[PDB]
Amino acid sequence: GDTKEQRILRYVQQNAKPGDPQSVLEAIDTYCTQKEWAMNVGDAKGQIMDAVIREYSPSLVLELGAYCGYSAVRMARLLQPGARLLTMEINPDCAAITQQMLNFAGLQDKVTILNGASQDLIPQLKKKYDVDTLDMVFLDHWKDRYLPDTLLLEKCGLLRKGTVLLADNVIVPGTPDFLAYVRGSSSFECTHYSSYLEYMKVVDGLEKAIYQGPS
Amino acid sequence: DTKEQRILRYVQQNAKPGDPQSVLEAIDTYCTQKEWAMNVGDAKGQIMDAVIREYSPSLVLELGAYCGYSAVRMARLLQPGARLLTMEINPDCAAITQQMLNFAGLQDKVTILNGASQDLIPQLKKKYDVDTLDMVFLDHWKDRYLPDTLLLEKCGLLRKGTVLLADNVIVPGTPDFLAYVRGSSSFECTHYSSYLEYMKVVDGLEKAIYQGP
Amino acid sequence: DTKEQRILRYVQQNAKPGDPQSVLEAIDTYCTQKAMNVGDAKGQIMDAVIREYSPSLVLELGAYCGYSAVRMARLLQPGARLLTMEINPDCAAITQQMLNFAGLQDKVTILNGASQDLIPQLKKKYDVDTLDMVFLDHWKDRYLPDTLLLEKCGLLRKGTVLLADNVIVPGTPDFLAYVRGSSSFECTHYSSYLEYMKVVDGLEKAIYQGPS
């Protein structure tokens, strides 16, 4: 059977307008709605991401986690000429799909896709990919890695004063260590944008509990 | 209008006044159409029905009313003399629930309390003449299942044999509540699996701007 | 990062590759950390049913994280197929990875979609005559409709075993009334208590007797 990401890409290729990032994003949205698949990042979170990018005009963005490439298209389409997105993806098939999604969108020249784990690639950014400091980091990979990778980014000298970290899913499934750390630290000035997450077609459950009397 | 007011209007325009089954079927029909709407679970409703028929509670506490589907579904199975108390924090939802019960003809069995569970629970004995509760349906804010259960205990509102039924203990999940009642010798627990077509929860994005050391 | 995706990461970092037993034990270990041993309660019944009937073609409705697929596939005789329907695409992907790590991928075909869409395609698209066993473990609202649909499509024969999971209260009274009331099914109920006084899991076995 075809992967979830392959099917999304195929719908884009058959329905979106080539070279039109907005058309690509709408076709992903339309397909996920039709299939009743929950979106990793939809338009609600996407509008928050757009607003941050437009406010800070980052020239170099690091993205942790690519999925089918929706978020990469969402951010890359707003980058100025000369600006650059680096996307880390641990799954080689998602990395290939993201590359092909960006190609269809006409955004291939703005994005470099790195296949591997964040903690293996981050220490290579300076020498292997000629990075000085990052202007913005979008964290959307394994939730238990947000704080370690933030500390790793700091230890590697990849953060400058004014680097924007934008972290998805900090409430659900949640990154409570990351939040407590950056909010408590004087090294980070923190703003939280409330939104929503959707679940579709998941196992749930009920509990019956019969009180036995005080014990 | 609000999404719950539209469900109420659909009931009032299509269901038979005085017929709880008709009201329940109309809500089900309307929610299935509307893609924004939480669908009603068949097996979940049957679990609720079976729990009420098995224990025949004379006094039920419901935490979280929403639009009144569950209040109609439970109150329709209460024996004469039994009552349901429903706590709902949203005033428009409390009003719609009252109108749903009025249309179903069930309003004499139910008392709707508009407010927060941890404010209202301590008032039950003195203000609403409660001795102990026979059954509690937990369906409100998931992070409140555990503290409100502990509060129901502390207030002396549970007796031996009181049945707690908690929904959504896996998604979004109430792991601390489950750890408590399963690990406590004060509760005998049974788990029922279920399936959710759709659920929307609060999430957020954090913007953290590095300042330097 | 999802609740099921972390089970897969825990298996990958703890179980022995190609060994279905250690994969099951890794999942059982993981799920018991955070509490009831449903894997054992449910899996003990599944094992006994599979070993009694030695099915050559099993249809599994619902996969979740792949535990049940690894559980049944590890017991299948050489040349036996498991077809697994899972509507959630993330759970389908996890189950495939779970089966890959256990070394059972060649016994199983994962179909990602809804049972009412997929069941009518089994004969044409997946070269199915009739099924030897069906494991109902998906949406309880679909237990009865899919049982009727499997009949209508001609996918059951005399002796086909249906086994329905988590029938306790029951939340599926219409399904039970149908198979128990019908002379076309001989029925057995299993209640697993493990060492406790409450039912950890309950299952209905319904054996098709033929059209009537």
Ligand SMILES: Cc1nc(C)c(-c2cc(CN)[nH]n2)s1
């Ligand atoms: C340690 C990790 N590094 C990366 C890039 C990860 C990741 C997570 C996802 C989403 N499935 N894509 N990439 S996890």
Ligand SMILES: Cc1nc(C)c(-c2cc(CN)[nH]n2)s1
């Ligand atoms: C602290 C709270 N008390 C109550 C009654 C709450 C509630 C939750 C819902 C469902 N949205 N209705 N009422 S939250």
Ligand SMILES: Cc1nc(C)c(-c2cc(CN)[nH]n2)s1
């Ligand atoms: C109509 C449906 N078809 C299928 C395969 C469903 C399902 C439910 C679950 C829960 N694990 N998995 N697949 S619902």
Ligand code: NA
């Ligand atoms: Na995300």
Ligand code: NA
């Ligand atoms: Na701070």
Ligand code: NA
């Ligand atoms: Na709906």
Ligand code: NA
């Ligand atoms: Na207990």
Ligand code: NA
């Ligand atoms: Na029968």
